[PDB]
Amino acid sequence: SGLVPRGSQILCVGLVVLDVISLVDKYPKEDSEIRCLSQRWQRGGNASNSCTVLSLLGAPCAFMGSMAPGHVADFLVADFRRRGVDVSQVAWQSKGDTPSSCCIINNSNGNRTIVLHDTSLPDVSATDFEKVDLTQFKWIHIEGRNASEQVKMLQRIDAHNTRQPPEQKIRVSVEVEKPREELFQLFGYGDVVFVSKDVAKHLGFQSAEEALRGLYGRVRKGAVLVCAWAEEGADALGPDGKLLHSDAFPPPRVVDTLGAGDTFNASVIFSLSQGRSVQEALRFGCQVAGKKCGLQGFDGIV
Amino acid sequence: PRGSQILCVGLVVLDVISLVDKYPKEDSEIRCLSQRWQRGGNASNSCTVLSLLGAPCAFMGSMAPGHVADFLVADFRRRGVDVSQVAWQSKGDTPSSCCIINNSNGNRTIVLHDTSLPDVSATDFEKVDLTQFKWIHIEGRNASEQVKMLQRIDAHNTRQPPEQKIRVSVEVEKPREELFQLFGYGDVVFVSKDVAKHLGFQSAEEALRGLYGRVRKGAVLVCAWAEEGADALGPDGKLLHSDAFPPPRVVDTLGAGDTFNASVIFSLSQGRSVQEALRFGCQVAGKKCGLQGFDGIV
Numbered sequence: 001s002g003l004v005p006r007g008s009q010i011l012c013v014g015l016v017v018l019d020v021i022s023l024v025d026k027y028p029k030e031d032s033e034i035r036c037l038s039q040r041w042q043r044g045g046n047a048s049n050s051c052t053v054l055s056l057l058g059a060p061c062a063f064m065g066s067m068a069p070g071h072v073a074d075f076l077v078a079d080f081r082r083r084g085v086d087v088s089q090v091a092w093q094s095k096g097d098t099p100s101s102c103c104i105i106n107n108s109n110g111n112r113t114i115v116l117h118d119t120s121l122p123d124v125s126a127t128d129f130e131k132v133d134l135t136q137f138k139w140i141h142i143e144g145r146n147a148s149e150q151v152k153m154l155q156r157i158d159a160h161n162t163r164q165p166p167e168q169k170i171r172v173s174v175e176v177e178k179p180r181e182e183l184f185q186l187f188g189y190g191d192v193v194f195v196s197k198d199v200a201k202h203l204g205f206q207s208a209e210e211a212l213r214g215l216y217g218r219v220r221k222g223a224v225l226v227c228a229w230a231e232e233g234a235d236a237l238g239p240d241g242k243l244l245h246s247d248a249f250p251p252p253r254v255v256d257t258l259g260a261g262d263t264f265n266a267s268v269i270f271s272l273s274q275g276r277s278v279q280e281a282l283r284f285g286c287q288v289a290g291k292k293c294g295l296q297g298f299d300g301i302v
Numbered sequence: 303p304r305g306s307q308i309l310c311v312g313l314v315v316l317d318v319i320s321l322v323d324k325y326p327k328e329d330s331e332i333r334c335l336s337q338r339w340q341r342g343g344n345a346s347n348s349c350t351v352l353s354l355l356g357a358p359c360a361f362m363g364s365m366a367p368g369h370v371a372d373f374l375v376a377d378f379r380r381r382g383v384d385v386s387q388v389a390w391q392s393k394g395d396t397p398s399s400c401c402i403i404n405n406s407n408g409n410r411t412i413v414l415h416d417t418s419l420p421d422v423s424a425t426d427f428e429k430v431d432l433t434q435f436k437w438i439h440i441e442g443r444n445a446s447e448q449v450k451m452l453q454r455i456d457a458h459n460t461r462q463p464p465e466q467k468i469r470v471s472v473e474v475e476k477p478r479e480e481l482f483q484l485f486g487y488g489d490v491v492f493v494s495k496d497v498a499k500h501l502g503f504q505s506a507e508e509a510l511r512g513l514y515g516r517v518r519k520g521a522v523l524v525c526a527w528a529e530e531g532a533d534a535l536g537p538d539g540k541l542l543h544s545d546a547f548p549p550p551r552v553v554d555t556l557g558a559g560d561t562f563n564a565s566v567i568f569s570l571s572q573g574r575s576v577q578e579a580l581r582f583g584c585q586v587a588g589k590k591c592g593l594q595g596f597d598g599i600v
């Protein structure tokens with residue numbers, strides 16, 4: 001690791017996982033041995049996916065998440081590095097496994113059977129976050145996971161910001177992606193709050209407009225609540241009460257939507273960190289995420 | 303060194319294992335209990351077991367330079383296996399697989415990534431000084447090329463006294479017509495339950511009586527049949543059988559057949575009878591079925 005200029009990086013706190021994806025002509029029968037058509041090892045995870053996109057956009061970025069020493073972590077570290085992501089803030093754990101998932105895709109009907117990673121690895125704690133010099137970062141994005149601990153991390157960034165002049169204040173964003181009650185306390189933190197379509201649907205909201213009007217009461221004074229909704233584009237709502245919307249930019253053919261939301265989050269964060277408006281950031285968010293949907297992986301998203 | 307090692311020729315795979323409560327339904331999302339990496343492959347699994355049994359052993363298979371091969375090599379060295387005979391390849395990736403182990407019954411479902419890696423050729427085998435080995439086990443794979451390797455061991459044996467002849471074994475694990483030419487080679491022939499079932503045989507007894515005509519004069523045909531144990535049949539025509547040694551809880555059957563093969567090979571290489579080797583084969587394979595991996599077999 002070397003010298004990182006002050007207020008230059010965008011930090012994404014969250015999960016990194018090794019996704020082993022196998023494409024099969026038919027789903028295997030229990031206790032059987034089949035040969036896959038093609039097999040890939042990928043670095044997944046929301047915060048991890050957003051780092052890749054932030055690097056491709058030309059932003060210096062850093063990742064913070066838990067990892068255990070081993071060959072799985074070595075592959076993920078090398079893949080982060082291949083995408084120019086800074087891994088100096090990784091929380092190296094003595095106990096637990098680096099997350100790894102097995103995804104079996106059936107080529108005959110497109111069905112995906114996923115065997116998710118185990119829960120052995122501890123998440124990043126408030127004490128792990130407390131040891132980080134925050135002066136390198138201009139923006140800190142937190143993927144909602146272990147909410148009680150993340151609230152303390154968010155409280156530490158507020159304490160830091162109270163001592164800085166407006167030009168050296170660290171902007172903050174949070175993602176509520178899974179419909180879990182523990183995560184809803186995170187709505188009240190951050191300057192930008194991303195809520196997923198899946199969370200909105202689980203709370204009874206049938207559109208991005210309903211979600212934003214129904215959830216704005218949970219965000220802190222002055223924050224912007226954002227809700228992406230696939231082919232219906234994305235909406236945003238700020239303190240002025242004006243619902244903002246961007247149409248989607250659907251690709252010529254949809255090839256791969258995995259990490260589309262993470263591409264949208266990184267692109268909105270990037271656009272706002274460059275001083276652009278919320279309306280311009282929604283549009284850019286939809287443009288990059290839309291381009292990504294017509295490509296396999298993140299190469300060529302530009 | 304002279305006639306001290308047991309050589310296993312075959313595949314070496316990186317097994318990415320997930321241990322689950324129950325096998326997933328298609329299109330479902332489950333959380334595994336745990337995960338681990340194991341050095342797999344039939345011949346490679348048999349080397350692990352042969353080392354744990356106290357046998358000096360060597361592995362021969364194709365590997366491509368890289369981090370996957372480095373992990374597997376370090377594991378072969380951690381398990382005391384000799385890797386000096388590895389056939390290093392300039393193209394193709396090292397094989398890997400996703401193994402889903404069901405903790406409730408020990409079933410193992412494997413999704414194998416069989417790469418563009420070339421197999422060990424008769425030319426690669428021709429460069430090996432065979433004097434170090436007392437036994438050579440060949441996992442059936444590229445049959446045309448392996449028949450030439452087997453023909454070379456016969457030529458070598460013709461020029462040696464009975465005491466210094468290299469004993470040979472073969473495994474026919476996959477139901478492929480190309481592999482059935484290998485029945486006519488080796489002193490011991492292992493045929494899998496899956497192969498026997500594919501040929502219409504509903505038991506180890508039917509398989510052995512129906513397939514003995516394919517083995518060479520004097521050979522022993524062996525057929526393991528999971529919870530039903532294993533059978534063997536030699537030139538005397540007497541069907542031998544061993545009951546299984548099931549653990550109260552069967553938690554991992556990944557590499558059980560390879561444990562049985564290594565244990566039968568080991569017992570026979572120590573001068574024990576076919577009957578004693580079948581029982582030991584089931585004893586060790588049975589103990590393995592109640593443990594995750596190969597630690598605690600001895």
Ligand SMILES: Nc1ncnc2c1ncn2[C@@H]1O[C@H](COP(=O)(O)OP(=O)(O)O)[C@@H](O)[C@H]1O
Binds near residue numbers: 249262
């Ligand atoms: N089918 C699609 N066509 C065009 N753009 C899409 C499509 N799916 C996703 N996007 C883009 O990605 C953004 C986030 O998509 P979304 O489906 O809500 O997230 P995710 O699929 O990762 O859960 C959308 O706002 C849109 O800009």
Ligand SMILES: Nc1ncnc2c1ncn2[C@@H]1O[C@H](COP(=O)(O)OP(=O)(O)O)[C@@H](O)[C@H]1O
Binds near residue numbers: 549
């Ligand atoms: N369920 C089981 N209970 C007891 N022993 C077993 C069981 N499964 C396998 N074994 C032992 O392993 C040997 C090989 O069995 P096999 O079904 O071919 O395993 P694999 O599925 O790994 O190929 C059997 O002969 C037996 O000794």
Ligand SMILES: O=P(O)(O)OC[C@@]1(O)O[C@@H](CO)[C@@H](O)[C@@H]1O
Binds near residue numbers: 344
């Ligand atoms: O459980 P089995 O049948 O004894 O064998 C396990 C096995 O060697 O199969 C290989 C694939 O052919 C490896 O993935 C695996 O370790």
